[PDB]
Structure 1
Amino acid sequence: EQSIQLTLGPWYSNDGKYSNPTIPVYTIQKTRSDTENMVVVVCGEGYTKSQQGKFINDVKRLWQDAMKYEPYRSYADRFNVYALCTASESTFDNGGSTFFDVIVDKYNSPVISNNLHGSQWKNHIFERCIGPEFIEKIHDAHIKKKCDPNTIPSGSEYEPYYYVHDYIAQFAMVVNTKSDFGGAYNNREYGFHYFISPSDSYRASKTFAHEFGHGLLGLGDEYSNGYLLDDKELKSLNLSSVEDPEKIKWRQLLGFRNTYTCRNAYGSKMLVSSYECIMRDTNYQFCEVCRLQGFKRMSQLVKDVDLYVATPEVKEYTGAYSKPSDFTDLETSSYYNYTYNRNDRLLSGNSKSRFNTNMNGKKIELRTVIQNISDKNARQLKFKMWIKHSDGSVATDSSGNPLQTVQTFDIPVWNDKANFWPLGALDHIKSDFNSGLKSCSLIYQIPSDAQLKSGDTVAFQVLDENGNVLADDNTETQRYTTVSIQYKFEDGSEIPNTAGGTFTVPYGTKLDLTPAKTLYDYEFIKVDGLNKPIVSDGTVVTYYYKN
């Protein structure tokens, strides 16, 4: 029913196997107007027409797993996700004609092969054919096509299609295969912004999150080798070759969580902010630098995100790893020695119970990093930290003074915002890592006469100017709950060509997004389940549309 149709002349389907394909469109998630959200378009490679059910379910699995990683997770409901059911003649594993002509080269890279059948523009198919048709017919902006993709434009072959990657935030191609591979193609100047990954490899979801991190977040391979020259130093979001801790771009994050610059391998001149990152080893999470940069990157594509507060931590303050000179050694063993010291000192998250009565007379530090997303509003955040008894009462010293301290932090504006992957950008060239960024550290001296009890813990809050709690001593370990969206007509029928996905939110979250006024051609009526604490897995938010 709902679909797009392409016209693929000899430059896109030289063997005539896909000269005029019909592509069913499935909406996996549309929580707001496309104009307000990041639009992701996923196509299948090597799925035959009878395998499109598998393709849809593969996309839902990969997408849901990607949304469990920060920083995506913080934006989970600000994506609209569409599955385009591109049908191949052959399965991928059978090796016959496929929709995207994908081959695996001698480096294990999946590549769209223009030379396979002589389709000279095959790897331009996303931004010249699929994208413009989708943006005209399906996307809420309905930008009418500007150029015939089977003709040579006057002037640039590329500029007429630049707009595609501003209305579609990411193209993904899922290959129907168990083969383990992955590749991301980011060259917007020449029209390329897609990645390819497999549906059923042993690490399929981790690979998907990684390639999406290259493609959408603009992060570099923390497995890369070589020395970054000054231009490439400024260009990289998450890599460096600057040995001096007083000069390295991410110096404000040094000592926060597992942020300790090190060589990404013995004797390497390529430096990473943490040895344990998915951008180097797909078994890990995103490091704090990648979370910050990716969160900043996505904030450019939506309008209502104005602050990043990394999850704060509390540590016994001994003076270790508290000054730049403590970070000068860049060997892997220095990274791990640092993380062991951090664990020995940690008093938050899963180490909250390490507090004890021997803590009197000691100092503790509440530490996080804050990025202002506004290029016009400076911010002032108030930090509170205190010693809490197990029953919730606030501990005191021997004079009845509560064991508590407060400090306010000024967050400067993001003056450099326009240089960091804004809408319309073709690349990231140079940005000031520290613009809008503020590492906040609140040190509390526990008095020698603290009246501590077994089971006491460190409590804390990060408050905004209205007193809203942005983060506290429960944030890091709080339970997340799964929510699933469904699209229905007034009469309870499921809307065709929808396949509502799930995502997760902190237990108790009240969802607050404004539904898109249209779904395909159907007009929105009402929604059940918004503005209501989400307190059970499988909670269903139901969007009702008028038939």
Structure 2
Amino acid sequence: SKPDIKVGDYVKMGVYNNASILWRCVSIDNNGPLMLADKIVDTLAYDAKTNDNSNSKSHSRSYKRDDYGSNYWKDSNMRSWLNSTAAEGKVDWLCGNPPKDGYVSGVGAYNEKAGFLNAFSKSEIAAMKTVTQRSLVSHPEYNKGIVDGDANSDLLYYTDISEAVANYDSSYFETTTEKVFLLDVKQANAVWKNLKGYYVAYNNDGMAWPYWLRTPVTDCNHDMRYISSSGQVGRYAPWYSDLGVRPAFYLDSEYFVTTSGSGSQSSPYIGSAPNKQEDDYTISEPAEDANPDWNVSTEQSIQLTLGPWYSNDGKYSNPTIPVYTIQKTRSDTENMVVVVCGEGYTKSQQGKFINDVKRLWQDAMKYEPYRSYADRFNVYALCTASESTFDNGGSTFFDVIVDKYNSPVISNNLHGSQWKNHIFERCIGPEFIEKIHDAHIKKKCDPNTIPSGSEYEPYYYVHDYIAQFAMVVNTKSDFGGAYNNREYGFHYFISPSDSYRASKTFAHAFGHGLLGLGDEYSNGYLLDDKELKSLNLSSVEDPEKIKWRQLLGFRNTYTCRNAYGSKMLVSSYECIMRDTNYQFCEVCRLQGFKRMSQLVKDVDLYVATPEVKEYTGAYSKPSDFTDLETSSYYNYTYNRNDRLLSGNSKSRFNTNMNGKKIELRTVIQNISDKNARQLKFKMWIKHSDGSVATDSSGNPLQTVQTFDIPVWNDKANFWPLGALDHIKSDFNSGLKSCSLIYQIPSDAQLKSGDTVAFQVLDENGNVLADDNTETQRYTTVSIQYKFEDGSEIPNTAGGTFTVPYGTKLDLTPAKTLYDYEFIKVDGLNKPIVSDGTVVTYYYKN
């Protein structure tokens, strides 16, 4: 038969200690029916003290785990034993500290013990569903960024089972997938609710026994929550062998078939799932080779001579770094060159690096202000082999450590290399510019020698020719680092490859490095000179004096404090700089666009997406913008949406809007210091048919207003090429907030489906923006680099960037790709209309 598993069902699956284990389905939940050992299978210790390795995995993150053991579940001796089929003496102990004698209290010694699953048959293991569950993480874990999700709180400690679950879902967590697991607090309380006093365990004698739970004490580094004989959830040090094991699995109901039994306590459902197909169960990671080979091509490479100051141990004394062109739309001189490098990527895992870079890069290019410049970035991935992965703790190429604050820092001290943080500017950068870059600037100085006048001066050229240095770490850890002191040569960011926020963190850190933007969450008064120094942060309360006064009232720009009472002020509560979920704010888009325009010579104007809003007069004057609370910001956003007649709200227009003023508004920045720009704005009510709407007397309902945008004199002072810092500049230079207000006539003829239509025209009549722009379709373009015969050029991994629909890409193709010479381009100067359009640059050899 195929059973139906109810709460209280008893199954007899597997054998431990030569007795089949009676499991009971305590709860039914989303993953499946939950089977819990009826009696504590054995009396063992969650995790022994640190014996073998203290520099890798859980025992590394706190040194008190030498004394007591580790409350990390993924590494635990319990997870390793419960989920092992291994023969005796061969259980992989994931943390690397086995449950050896003298590290588990008392007799202990469950190293040399066969895995729990070893005596089981393969079919019985198949019947346990491989489930991905949240496991709360302790402070050593959540300060080294070992967290799969957003949630910020420590679990509150309540001993009663009723109150034990408090804060669980809001608590720090990471997701672990396994067949056999010890119950967490939520699941123990579920067992309680469904099955009364069954949450108190009983051993073979029948005396009540404490049993371990996988929930750690989030405030503590070693302690583990456990269920005692009385029934109190409590904390025990994990090294002790007094406490019991009550393993639980999730039945895979569909394949499961019970050959015998009714599921009663006396007569359990005896069953397994034969036809279910699985690779042999191994929670253990596959073992890669000691000496890898490159997954990727080495045909195009840069070779670095790193002396003692850069590699004191000597493992990177002459690295060969393969180079991959993810994007080379134009020449390096004309474009912004981004160099991404790899941390904790072994030779065999370099393909992953390339794909990761592509992933992250493309996701970053979905964000504006980058999207406007997507085709202007030259993107290069440098394959920097690491002897070990980041999580293995072996020597990594860049020596990245994570400090106590979750900050990822290249450590000069770790291998005793004083100048490791200077590797990008002094070692990697000069070689890239000499070899890969079209400028081919020969290296004037020896990084290994000592410069004569300023130890930081000669390397200043690197940052001109390379816009950004990025480091991607082969980690699911969540951390971000931005290092932006050009005087001392530091222009680089460190970000993770597979964190839940990997692409968001990448975009954020890129915003520091290239755009120059600061963290909007940071708390602290900005004094006068520092206040001039910050592009996106101000401590000026008065709306009339604030830097972004012109942009106030545009889209979601209301000036608000980042945190309560704080003297630090931001243009929008929702920006990527404060919260990585949210997109870049208008001040950031403007300032980053201006910075990138300094880097590339084509752009002449910035037109923010115009918005048509009804003109109540709310938020129309500087006084209205005085309140600086976050609540007031959200009230402004509500009023804006209730007024908005543009974009997605283009259909909010109605027959009643006669006698009502409507306001078209944009912010326009003139990127040209030399010549001022006259831009015409046209706003007419549009019938669904498409003809301009009329009043009763037939006069068209349309408004025209010509705004002249001034020159950008302070251009030289705002992030010029060749600039160490933004010491002072004027926000308002070259910036005009253009507002056209139209009184819809009181006698106007309005029908259903009429919508406001606006063209922002230049002098020649080219339409810079229109009512379709905000909603306009973005179509993916893939750039490919091929030989004449159609064979793929090696060391090129073309990315995908989004261009607006109907965009005709007109970018002079780069004369040379590596030593290859450009013969033709396919797909340029043609409307891009399909997602997945491919532009193929053909080079010859």
2:321 alignment partner in structure 1? 23
Describe the superposition over 1:247-269 as per-residue Cα deviations: whole angstroms up to 9, x where unpaired. Answer: 00000000000000011111111
Q: Distance in 2 between matches of 1:540 and 1:162?
A: 38
Secondary structure of the equivalent of 1:462? strand
1:353 corresponds to which of 648, 651, 661: 651
Shift in Å at residue 333 of structure 1?
A: 1.1
Shift in Å at residue 139 of structure 1?
A: 0.3
Shift in Å at residue 459 of structure 1?
A: 0.3
Shift in Å at residue 102 of structure 1?
A: 0.2
Shift in Å at residue 287 of structure 1?
A: 0.3
Q: Distance in 2 between matches of 1:476 and 1:428?
A: 31
Secondary structure of the equivalent of 1:239? coil
1:374 corresponds to which of 665, 672, 679: 672
Q: Distance in 1 between matches of 2:689 and 2:354?
A: 49
Q: Distance in 2 between matches of 1:468 and 1:443?
A: 22
Describe the superposition over 1:160-208 as per-residue Cα deviations: whole angstroms up to 9, x where unpaired. Answer: 0000000000000000000000100000000000000000000100000
Shift in Å at residue 479 of structure 1?
A: 0.7
Corresponding position: 1:267 with 2:267: no
1:449 corresponds to which of 737, 747, 750: 747
Structure 1 residue ranges without an equivalent (≥5)? none
Q: Distance in 1 between matches of 2:567 and 2:456?
A: 36
Corresponding position: 1:302 with 2:600: yes
1:167 alignment partner in structure 2? 465
Describe the superposition over 1:353-389 as per-residue Cα deviations: whole angstroms up to 9, x where unpaired. Answer: 1100110000000000000000101000000000011
Secondary structure of the equivalent of 2:631? helix
Q: Distance in 2 between matches of 1:182 and 1:244?
A: 33
Describe the superposition over 1:385-425 as per-residue Cα deviations: whole angstroms up to 9, x where unpaired. Answer: 00011111111000001110000000000011000000000
1:364 alignment partner in structure 2? 662
Secondary structure of the equivalent of 1:253? coil
Shift in Å at residue 39 of structure 1?
A: 0.2
Secondary structure of the equivalent of 1:53? helix
2:28 alignment partner in structure 1? none
Q: Distance in 2 between matches of 1:156 and 1:231?
A: 26
Q: Distance in 2 between matches of 1:264 and 1:156?
A: 39
2:715 alignment partner in structure 1? 417
Shift in Å at residue 454 of structure 1?
A: 1.0
2:352 alignment partner in structure 1? 54
Shift in Å at residue 288 of structure 1?
A: 0.3
Secondary structure of the equivalent of 1:300? helix
Q: Distance in 2 between matches of 1:138 and 1:253?
A: 41
1:254 alignment partner in structure 2? 552
Shift in Å at residue 228 of structure 1?
A: 0.4
Q: Percent same amino acid among aligned pairs?
A: 100
Secondary structure of the equivalent of 2:515? coil
Secondary structure of the equivalent of 2:350? helix
Shift in Å at residue 232 of structure 1?
A: 0.7
Describe the superposition over 1:472-505 as per-residue Cα deviations: whole angstroms up to 9, x where unpaired. Answer: 0000001100000111111111111100111001
Q: Distance in 2 between matches of 1:27 and 1:529?
A: 19
Q: Distance in 2 between matches of 1:466 and 1:528?
A: 30
Describe the superposition over 1:86-120 as per-residue Cα deviations: whole angstroms up to 9, x where unpaired. Answer: 00000111010000000010000000000011011
Describe the superposition over 1:101-152 as per-residue Cα deviations: whole angstroms up to 9, x where unpaired. Answer: 0001000000000001101100100000000001001100000001010010
Secondary structure of the equivalent of 1:127? helix
Q: Distance in 2 between matches of 1:490 and 1:352?
A: 48
Q: Distance in 1 between matches of 2:555 and 2:721?
A: 31
Secondary structure of the equivalent of 1:67? helix
How many residue pairs match? The answer is 547
Q: Distance in 1 between matches of 2:689 and 2:728?
A: 51
Shift in Å at residue 318 of structure 1?
A: 1.0
1:331 corresponds to which of 609, 629, 652: 629
Secondary structure of the equivalent of 2:318? coil
Q: Distance in 2 between matches of 1:299 and 1:207?
A: 23
Q: Distance in 2 between matches of 1:24 and 1:278?
A: 33
Shift in Å at residue 45 of structure 1?
A: 0.2
Q: Distance in 2 between matches of 1:108 and 1:233?
A: 27
Describe the superposition over 1:447-475 as per-residue Cα deviations: whole angstroms up to 9, x where unpaired. Answer: 00010001110000100111000000000
Shift in Å at residue 29 of structure 1?
A: 0.3
Q: Answer with 1 or 2: which has the greater Rg.
A: 2
Shift in Å at residue 325 of structure 1?
A: 0.5
Secondary structure of the equivalent of 2:432? helix
Secondary structure of the equivalent of 1:252? coil
Structure 2 residue ranges without an equivalent (≥5)? 1-298
Q: Distance in 2 between matches of 1:241 and 1:339?
A: 22
Shift in Å at residue 432 of structure 1?
A: 0.7
Corresponding position: 1:427 with 2:735: no
Q: TM-score, normalised by structure 1?
A: 1.00
Q: Distance in 1 between matches of 2:790 and 2:755?
A: 50
Q: Distance in 2 between matches of 1:343 and 1:485?
A: 38
Describe the superposition over 1:263-291 as per-residue Cα deviations: whole angstroms up to 9, x where unpaired. Answer: 11111110000111000000000000000
Secondary structure of the equivalent of 1:115? coil
Q: Distance in 2 between matches of 1:374 and 1:327?
A: 30
Shift in Å at residue 546 of structure 1?
A: 1.1
Secondary structure of the equivalent of 2:341? strand
Stretches of 4+ aligned residues off by more than 2 angstroms: none
Secondary structure of the equivalent of 2:379? strand
Q: What does 1:91-130 correspond to in 2, within 5 Å?
A: 91-130=389-428
Corresponding position: 1:68 with 2:366: yes
Shift in Å at residue 57 of structure 1?
A: 0.2
Secondary structure of the equivalent of 2:656? helix
Shift in Å at residue 512 of structure 1?
A: 0.1
Larger relative CO (CA 8 A, sep 6+): 1 or 2?
A: 1
Q: Distance in 2 between matches of 1:216 and 1:415?
A: 21
Secondary structure of the equivalent of 2:746? coil
Aligned-pair RMSD on alpha carbons?
A: 0.5
Q: Distance in 1 between matches of 2:488 and 2:563?
A: 33
Shift in Å at residue 153 of structure 1?
A: 1.0
Secondary structure of the equivalent of 2:494? strand
Secondary structure of the equivalent of 1:295? helix
Q: Distance in 2 between matches of 1:91 and 1:379?
A: 54
Secondary structure of the equivalent of 1:26? strand
Q: TM-score, normalised by structure 2?
A: 0.65
